Amino acid sequence: SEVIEDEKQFYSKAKTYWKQIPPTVDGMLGGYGHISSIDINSSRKFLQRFLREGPNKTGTSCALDCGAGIGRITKRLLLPLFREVDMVDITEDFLVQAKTYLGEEGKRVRNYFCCGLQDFTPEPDSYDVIWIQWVIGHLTDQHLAEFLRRCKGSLRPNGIIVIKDNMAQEGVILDDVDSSVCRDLDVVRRIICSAGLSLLAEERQENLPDEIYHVYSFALR
């Protein structure tokens, strides 16, 4: 709330920025398209702990990719582990491109949704895993909290919400170029608890370039 002065401009500027980004992996990853394989291999081990290690295993039937872009995570992380996948993104051109990028396994993407997370209500009791990566900084603290609570009602039994995103070492940093905020661990943990979710696991991503923000993965339900 504190670093976002005008909510309408905050969302409007962010939409303008992504409409001017090429629909490629490098566009999704802000010039770091080459770290994608490290990210995916890391995300896979983090997720497989919940799909393969009991007692309360997570299902493998349906997953929701939030901020999916052209489907970078959907192609290499979700589709090989889940029978079905839904995608949601605010940038229409990215969802158009996804149908080419996904290739033959994209036939198992059942629903494409073009709208912001602040407007999206995932269907209740419908998903095993809701994957939210590098998009939470584009939401206000209130909208993130209400979206996550709406995600809680959308989970199947033993389902989890996974947030993987940039985390500041301390405090909150506004990015006035792409109109996004970077939060520290404590601020995000307050938003998660405000959504009524419990923390199951956290993990700091390793093998990333020195200059970039720290990346953490949260498993919630």
Ligand X SMILES: N=C(N)NCCC[C@H](NC(=O)[C@H](CCCCN)NC(=O)[C@@H]1C=CCN1C(=O)Cc1cccc2ccccc12)C(N)=O
**Binding-site entries for S-adenosyl-L-methionine:** 67, 72, 89-91, 117-118, 133
- For residue 57 the two structure tokens come to 């295993």
The bridge status of strand 84-89 relative to strand 62-66 is: parallel
Binding footprint of ligand X, residue count (CB under 6 A): 14
Q: Could you tell me if 74 and 87 are in contact, meaning their C-beta atoms sit under 8 angstroms apart? A: yes
Q: Which of ligand SAH, ligand X, none lies near 18, with the C-beta cut-off 5 to 8 A by kind?
A: ligand SAH
Q: Which of ligand SAH, ligand X, none lies near 184, with the C-beta cut-off 5 to 8 A by kind?
A: none
Residue ranges in 106-165 that form contacts with ligand SAH under rule CB under 6 A: 116-118, 133-135, 138-139
Contact pick of 42, 166, 205, 217 for ligand X (by CB under 6 A): 166
Taking the CA atoms of residue 65, residue 79, residue 107 and residue 101 in that order, the dihedral angle to the nearest 10 degrees is: 70
Q: Could you tell me if 219 and 51 are in contact, meaning their C-beta atoms sit under 8 angstroms apart? A: no
Q: Tell me the longest C-alpha to C-alpha distance in the chain.
A: 46
Question: Residue positions in the annotated binding site?
Answer: 67, 72, 89-91, 117-118, 133
Q: Which is nearer to ligand SAH, 116 or 159 (CB)?
A: 116
Q: Which of ligand SAH, ligand X, none lies near 97, with the C-beta cut-off 5 to 8 A by kind?
A: none
| Residues 80-119 as x/- pattern, contact with ligand X by CB under 6 A | ----------------------------------------
Contact pick of 42, 43, 58, 91 for ligand SAH (by CB under 6 A): 91
Rounded Cα distance, 30 and 24, in Å: 10
Residue ranges in 184-213 that form contacts with ligand SAH under rule CB under 6 A: none
Rounded Cα distance, 67 and 63, in Å: 13
Beta bridge partners of 127: 155
In a 13 Å sphere around the CA of 51, the CA atoms on its Cβ side amount to 20
Q: Which of ligand X, ligand SAH, none lies near 67, with the C-beta cut-off 5 to 8 A by kind?
A: ligand SAH
Which residues 6+ apart lie within 8 Å of 216 measured at CB?
Answer: 164, 165, 167, 185, 202, 203, 204, 205
For binding to ligand SAH (CB under 6 A), which residues are involved?
14, 18, 28, 67-69, 72-73, 89-91, 94, 116-118, 133-135, 138-139
For binding to ligand X (CB under 6 A), which residues are involved?
29-30, 32, 35, 134, 137-138, 166, 175, 178, 180, 211-213
